[PDB]
Design a binder for these strands. Structure first.
Lengths: 430, 26, 430, 26, 430, 26, 430, 26, 26, 26
RNA sequence: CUCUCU
RNA sequence: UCUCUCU
RNA sequence: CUCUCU
RNA sequence: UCUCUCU
RNA sequence: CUCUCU
RNA sequence: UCUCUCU
RNA sequence: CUCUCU
RNA sequence: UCUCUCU
RNA sequence: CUCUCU
RNA sequence: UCUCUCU
RNA sequence: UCUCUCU
RNA sequence: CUCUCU
């Protein structure tokens, strides 16, 4: 166990990134003149996060520079801002310089770019999108059946995410990117060749290697290796990739799960005086659960909508429990979790074509009875196509993965005593 | 259709459910 | 045979290092105020060894100095200490100066740094880690299959180990380092070039040369030479290195095997009055076996755990028999060795999040019926890829390596009469 | 999977076993 | 035109090889004690050629050494020898040392191995086999239809032939080898991997590259490149290779055509005093035609068989005109060529189970009215599968290849004036 | 069945014949 | 601008070489007894040039000495000589001593070897061969597609050419030599090693360095450097070199273009009294154009052939405009240039198997309306494979290279006023 | 096939032509 | 390409600029 | 492997043997 | 498809 | 040291 | 791809 | 001392 | 990279 | 006694 | 599948 | 001053 | 490569 | 004051 | 500076 | 693969 130094270094690094994010949000709130209530709005924090993400999108910035937009300059950003006077909420659009946002981000991080914070914000946005909306249209359009949605974790993450974004995204998103590449390859013949051919080939190499590392058992690993070997892949290995994503429902790969909290929680924590540089942090440890335990976040509530359902959606987005079992999610939270079918709430974002006269603000109940450590595994699983098919046959609805690994009480900060759950609906998108 | 099997996020002992009447047949 | 003078000099040097280690442990036990029973705990000896290793880690010390930790000063070290009053064990954390530990180490070695003792302690820790835990996660993460684990000997040894550490570590660890270098090279293009480029190139040179010397037959040696020749290695020679490690399962390289005993045994031997400077020592001779024969070591035993299994694990870690054949290991020890699958014991280290109310202490039965001389060879083996493949085809489950080389009785201190074993399970990690 | 062949530590005559049904094929 | 030196060097080299072959045959005839009539038998020359080929077959020699045969020693060779006393032919079996044959071959070539002569003899044997027998059974067994036989040129050439053997063999033989490899690959999974995997992969590489160079137009070249790209080829590219051989009937590749005369003609020429070292030689020039013009060869004639048909078969085998157009072959020879269907003759070889009482000897009329230069081209031809199919559509039974390239009179040794032929049956195997 | 098209050996002008009623259709 | 002295020295040196060539041709004409008309034949001048080149070919001379030819002594040379009596042309073969030719060459150059003249004659022969024949067979044989022929400039230059020959030859010829080396390396394993291994390695070094210097942009330069880095290059970098030659069609390297006139023009100029030692010379300046302006050359014309087409071919060979744009070539010459497709003429050389009864002599119209300075550049161009591919994408059929650099009138000897051309077929081999 | 792009010999302003329908695609 | 870093001629306090996106990588 | 060529100790006429199938190739 | 398991 | 035109 | 094995 | 535009 | 072989 | 910003 | 050609 | 047999 | 850390 | 043919 | 649970 | 972003 020589990792203690390495683990402490990683904890210090993630704590530094969290502290930088919190101080940046504090600076943005101070400069934008929002009260304590207005600064704690999740919509305002999401708007600020989109501010940062659009400011630092280099490819998008260059695209807007060299193709100008229609009536929208490529130099400034916008975002919905909600402020309260006389008790009533209204939305107004602010215009802020991309250069100013970048300078604020650099200053809040001791003059360092700190792409880790940007990736963390992107992962939080992707988790929110996954927990809120279903992209079955993209599934059906590319040829994959809408039947599988568990593997679509992190499907909204843009390519600018680093290695963490690739690790956190599911097998289905990688397969979707692969099929998009294959479709673009069937479209035209001048592909795989030329100057762009080398770049697209190395991109295929890297994405197929991260899918290589994502998987668990040897037969499906060999299958992904073989479909990689194809120089000019086409329709047969199109169906091969469809089958490979198809087999992931039974023998899943290792997909990372992280607790990416909104910038509002980090800003409130930093405003309280918490210094994550010394105390450390861990995206899979108790720290995010404890931070959510003693943090208050307010959200805009549409008419005839349930605040409890929106709070549950926000909690699942925060903890990336969109595809987590309903029973274990209810046990961890302590309140029975409502699947997406009977969620009487729309998305947390408020559209432009909405009335600023019938909206109310409610506190988000982001409190959980139990806390658990997120696992990046896939579960116990113990020609090659027939071998893979034979593996699915063996699985019975009783195999117990993570044997001896339970949940822990919030007071149990080091996880001395796990709690064994005893076990209705079990699928969020069912 | 809908969601089928599961995406293990938390390290808790469980019985990961699947719906064979349609997944096994294809 | 003019080596007798050289062999005697090496024996004197290793005996001096062992004597220094023993006297250092005696000094540490005297200053830390532990009784005879408490001083013989393997957990306490491991804590003291970690004390020394963390004290002398120059790069880690500088890292902690110039990036301070969170609430943990970079000036002092800590470690679990177990003491007994009224018959009950408890764990308390001591804080000792790195400078004080370094001064004690220098004084115990006649004012000499004596990095040989540090390397010996590191090799003992690595052997314990190899005999206790499987690092299949690191194997799968870097792309190598989890299928091979025999070559992973000394995978936990840090880079600060000298030539002895490089010689004792297996082919798999060198391949793992090579693939980590290749992965870091595929990550960014500014590698192999610049000021860091020269240093990483000479590091690749030296590690590829030690892998060069590790191997046995000419074809695989030529293969490692050719993959060395590549100025900017990539994916093809990525698979070449995968194959080269793959071929080591059939035609193995020469990996050194040493008997690195814990500091507790050396301290007890020095306390008994044994002087290794005059009598000499040999990490591959009878001396470690005889030392373990007349030494007593106590260990903490977790509830519902078998002391015999923990003693077997400690013995295999001491003699580096983690990947040794089960039958020959049982024959040498005299008791049938239980593979890791049915070992009803966890690691020897006791974690912080453990209860100091249900733990008991038991004597470790580190006694072996027979003793044998450790061999640094790999075994008889008698384009180049096809030639290497053809070599694997010839091997039949009957080739007898080390012909005429048997085991010897403990009374047979010079190995007059070898004993021929006559030959169930045969793999520890199976 | 698991451990396959052997890592000779002691200088004793033996028959170093391997599991061909999977090692030879790859 | 700086090739004149290179062309003269190649002419000198081929003349030296021909002179060595002739002197070797003279030595063998002198030592075996055959008269002038017996030494001019084509059966005896074929037996001597088989002597040399079996003597120098290294793999076959090792196979016979380490698996001995049943009652046949691996040290000596045998072959049918026909001698005449009192006017009657009989067959007797001689036993000669492989070492003695090798020593005679080396001595006849100034102590040089001279594998060029061996390859020339093998190509002569392959041309004879192609002109005599149809291997439709091998075609049907491997899955290719028996419909195509033009591409089967040099299908009987063993793998020990050098680059000349690979160049002279047709596209169909390369495809047959490829499908044999694919069938062996579908048989077992442990292929493409291991020590034998590397060797079989480089063998596939080299044979696919020589098929690469054999072809003519760009689309089919791209197709063979793509089927090469497959790491683990199977059934789809099985059909791809079937189609690629299928397309060769319409857009043929470049297959070399050489005049490989039997060792009898060379021996007679050397006995006449002709020195090919100074005069030079050319396998595609007038030299073989002129050599056959002034050479006499006798052959054994079975009962109720036509000497003219056997002479025509021998002539076509000598000039590799087995698949040549019947009309142009008749025009060059000056006598109308009988296709294989109405050839009233069996093979030139006489089987062991034959009577030595009803056989007669007749002179072979290997005289041609015209002589022509052999061409290694395929003919004018001016997704990719559809593009290849579209190319076959354009071809009309009137395209004139080799425009302006006619035949030449035997007195026209430098080909001043070509003769334009004016144009019944046209297929030998029809 | 039988031989179909041709294997040009000699460099003579010609009209290389093929039998379309079966080769073109497959 | 301190090059004026260097430029004047180079002009004096090239003028001295031209004067030596002219006086040597005058000596050869005087000794061989040809009239003014016979001495001005381009065929006779080509025969004399081959005389000199074969006389001084040291490796070829040694080869012929130690392997003698068949009926052709290694001591003397031959060549076609055409003389006119009674108005009719006939060809007779002369036999001249190699030693005598060498002595004449040394005497004509003041006792100096003057390899510059030999290299100039070789470059003239190579330009004639490039402008006359297409070596698509060598392209297809080595694996490169026949699609590209622009880079094949100077493909017929033998290795004995100095640095000027390496500079004038195109990228395609260097790639062809590299692939020949790679093919010879795949043929046998004992390469890259041994005494011949060092020599072939330094040869690869030097040829890869001259290709290094030939190229223009940084990415392709880095690519050639990396393929150089490979110690034992094979199939992957085989395709890498194929791609590197492939990219030269879009981003070309710097290939020198020189006006190498035949020895007939130099001999006529020297006979007129022109002294190039004082007046100077320049292979890229106006001097060759002016020399061709006031020089008359006669050539043998085959029956039913156009003298204008042969004159155009000779002019393009002289000015190395074989791959030059058809429009600019027509503008410079003043007469529309016929591409090779509709050139109704064969090669300038007359073969041995030709009739000396239907040949006529015509004057070569080597007069150009405009003159231009030859450029050694490639044109404006402004992983690394993808970067190279992306560069090809940018190029549009309108980029104007050599901006402001036009053609000049023959009276404009210093190029005061360039002429801007205003712009049908554009490819000679199209 | 045939010649495709160009080999600039003379220093004259021009528009060096290439045939993309086949060169760009490979 | 072009000029990259700087050649200090005058003794004036400054911040000598370089272009890392290409110099550091090689 | 093993011993290959020779180490001339005695002054006797001989033909110093070598094994080219491996020495020449490297 | 007469002489050869696959 | 065997042989057979054409499943 | 008519004259040059490879 | 040979030769050929364009598998 | 228009005027200088290398 | 020559000259050219930027393969 | 309400707001986005493909 | 951290830890874990076995994606 | 049985007895010698490196 | 030791020893071992052949990773 | 756009948005949508579920073809 | 429970506790360490990548």
């Amino acid at each position: 166990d020589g990792e203690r130094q390495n683990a402490t270094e990683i904890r210090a690094s993630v704590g530094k990134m969290i502290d930088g994010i919190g101080r940046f949000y504090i600076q943005m709130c101070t400069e934008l003149k929002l009260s304590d209530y207005e600064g704690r709005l999740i919509q305002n924090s999401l708007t600020i996060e989109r501010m940062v993400l659009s400011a630092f999108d280099e490819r998008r910035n260059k695209y807007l520079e060299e193709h100008p937009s229609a009536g929208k300059d490529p130099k400034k950003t916008g975002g919905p801002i909600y402020r309260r006077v006389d008790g009533k909420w209204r939305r107004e659009l602010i215009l802020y310089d991309k250069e100013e946002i970048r300078r604020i981000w650099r200053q809040a991080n001791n003059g360092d770019d700190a792409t880790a914070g940007l990736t963390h914000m992107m992962i939080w946005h992707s988790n929110l999108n996954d927990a809120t909306y279903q992209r079955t249209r993209a599934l059906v359009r590319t040829g994959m059946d809408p039947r599988m949605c568990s593997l679509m974790q992190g499907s909204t993450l843009p390519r600018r995410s680093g290695a963490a974004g690739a690790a956190v995204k599911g097998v289905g998103t990688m397969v979707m990117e692969l099929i998009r590449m294959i479709k673009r390859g069937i479209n035209d013949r001048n592909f795989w060749r030329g100057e762009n051919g080398r770049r697209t080939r190395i991109a295929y190499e890297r994405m197929c290697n991260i899918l290589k590392g994502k998987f668990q058992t040897a037969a499906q690993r060999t299958m992904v290796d073989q479909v990689r070997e194809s120089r000019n892949p086409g329709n047969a290995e199109f169906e091969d990739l469809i089958f490979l994503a198809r087999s992931a429902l039974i023998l899943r790969g290792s997909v990372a799960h992280k607790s990416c909290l909104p910038a509002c929680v980090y800003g409130s924590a930093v405003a309280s005086g918490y210094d994550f540089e010394r105390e450390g942090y861990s995206l899979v440890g108790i720290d995010p659960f404890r931070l959510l335990q003693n943090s208050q976040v307010y959200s805009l509530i549409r008419p005839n909508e349930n605040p409890a359902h929106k709070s549950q959606l926000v909690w699942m987005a925060c903890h990336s429990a969109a595809f987590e079992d309903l029973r274990v999610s209810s046990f961890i939270r302590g309140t029975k979790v409502v699947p997406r079918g009977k969620l009487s709430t729309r998305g947390v974002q408020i559209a432009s074509n909405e009335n600023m006269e019938t909206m109310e603000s409610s506190t988000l109940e982001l409190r959980s009875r139990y806390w658990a450590i997120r696992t990046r595994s896939g579960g116990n699983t113990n020609d090659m196509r027939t071998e893979i098919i034979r593996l699915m046959e063996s699985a019975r609805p009783e195999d117990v993965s993570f044997q001896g690994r339970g949940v822990f009480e919030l007071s149990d900060e080091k996880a001395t005593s796990p709690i064994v759950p005893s076990f209705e609906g079990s699928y969020f998108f069912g | 259709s809908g969601q089928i099997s599961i995406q293990p996020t938390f390290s808790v002992q469980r019985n990961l459910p699947f719906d064979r009447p349609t997944i096994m047949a294809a």
